Design a protein around this ligand. Structure first.
Ligand SMILES: NC1CCN(c2nc(Nc3cc(C4CC4)[nH]n3)c3sccc3n2)CC1
Length: 288
């Protein structure tokens, strides 16, 4: 019965030698599982990012889900290899870095924040319409292009739902960003991603998710009891922004906005061009 799951992901990986297609191999990061490098396509002259035991079932889920859900607001999966003993997942390279650096080292005005939310909601609307829940939306899993491109990544925790089983009840995600209905093991749908988006907006405002100074469990408890979080300074924000936040962070899932609904919110109408994010990127790179 197992681990014939290991032979399953051997079917997925492509045929050939990795070294023969991508030169200019250079490392640019590492984070628990696993580590990230860089390279160029000898064929097309394209720069690419290469990620490099436990529970490899996730890495399968990540490959498959990424392959069948191409979107301009998703970090594009390319090829896969395994000629060694670690995964050779190749994806498009965004040099601007993660949104985390930006939210914790810079100040974003509402026009910048709206632009980010709109790009993310676009990815969410696409994924949800394909019955996929990301379940781990956070600034850490938002990568930025040097041109201000905003793309979604990390799909190991994705949940493929079906008309027969459109809900889950497993506590997956990262505590500070997890919807109350996920924390309290209740039946939940795609709008949990919308909750995590809201939390990420709080990131973009206050620098970090609510209860971050608390321990993960304490945070988990607080989310389960407090429900919808409070801004430290709600009055700093426009009325239309506060509204968008309220409809992202609604306790009533039915009263909470869908991606498609939220893409029509008046708040996104004050979104700046994506080029406006490049100064935020340069700022984050500095002080680092
Ligand atoms: N949470 C992680 C997310 C990945 N990350 C990351 N990714 C970057 N660009 C990438 C990565 C990918 C492949 C991995 C999907 N394409 N483009 C860059 S550029 C400067 C820093 C940096 N950090 C480090 C934190």
């Amino acid at each position: 019965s197992d681990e014939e799951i290991l032979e399953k992901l051997r079917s997925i990986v492509s045929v050939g030698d990795p070294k023969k297609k991508y030169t200019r191999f250079e490392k640019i990061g590492q984070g628990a599982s696993g580590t990230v490098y860089t390279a160029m396509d000898v064929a097309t002259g394209q720069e690419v990012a290469i990620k490099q035991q436990p529970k490899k079932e996730l890495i399968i889920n990540e490959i498959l889900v990424m392959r069948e859900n191409k979107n301009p607001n998703i970090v594009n999966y390319l090829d896969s290899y395994l000629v060694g003993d670690e995964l050779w997942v190749v994806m498009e390279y965004l040099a601007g870095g993660s949104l985390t650096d930006v939210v914790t080292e810079t100040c974003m005005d509402e026009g910048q924040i709206a632009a980010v939310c709109r790009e993310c909601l676009q990815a969410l609307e696409f994924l949800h319409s394909n019955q996929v829940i990301h379940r781990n939306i956070k600034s850490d899993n938002i990568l930025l292009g040097m041109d201000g491109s905003v793309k979604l990544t990390d799909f190991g925790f994705c949940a493929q739902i079906t008309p027969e089983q459109s809900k889950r009840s497993t506590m997956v995600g990262t505590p500070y960003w997890m919807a109350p209905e996920v924390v309290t093991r209740k039946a939940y749908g795609p709008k949990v991603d919308i909750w995590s988006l809201g939390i990420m907006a709080i990131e973009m405002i206050e620098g970090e998710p609510p209860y971050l100074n608390e321990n993960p469990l304490r945070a988990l408890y607080l989310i389960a009891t407090n429900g919808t979080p409070e801004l430290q300074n709600p009055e700093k924000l426009s009325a239309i922004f506060r509204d968008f936040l309220n409809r992202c962070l609604e306790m009533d899932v039915e009263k909470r906005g869908s991606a498609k609904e939220l893409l029509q919110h008046q708040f996104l109408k004050i979104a700046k061009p994506l080029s406006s994010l490049t100064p935020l990127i340069a700022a984050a790179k500095e002080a680092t």
